[PDB]
């Protein structure tokens, strides 16, 4: 369970970062 969750969070970390990056200049 934990092994998968760590992977989920790592991916979300990247995805939220990308979103924060795209709305950053708006």
XYZ file of C-alpha atoms in Angstrom:
26
model
C 0.000 0.000 0.000
C 2.642 2.472 1.118
C 4.941 1.660 -1.815
C 2.140 2.662 -4.188
C 1.111 5.742 -2.236
C 4.681 7.080 -2.283
C 4.553 6.686 -6.063
C 1.163 8.402 -6.263
C 2.405 11.397 -4.269
C 5.614 11.707 -6.295
C 3.529 11.882 -9.482
C 1.046 14.365 -8.001
C 4.000 16.455 -6.786
C 5.115 16.753 -10.412
C 1.606 17.376 -11.718
C 0.750 20.104 -9.219
C 4.116 21.671 -9.965
C 3.389 21.771 -13.691
C 0.028 23.404 -13.029
C 1.600 25.953 -10.679
C 4.141 26.587 -13.444
C 1.549 27.213 -16.170
C -0.614 29.612 -14.149
C 2.502 31.243 -12.746
C 2.804 33.751 -15.578
C -0.940 34.501 -15.796
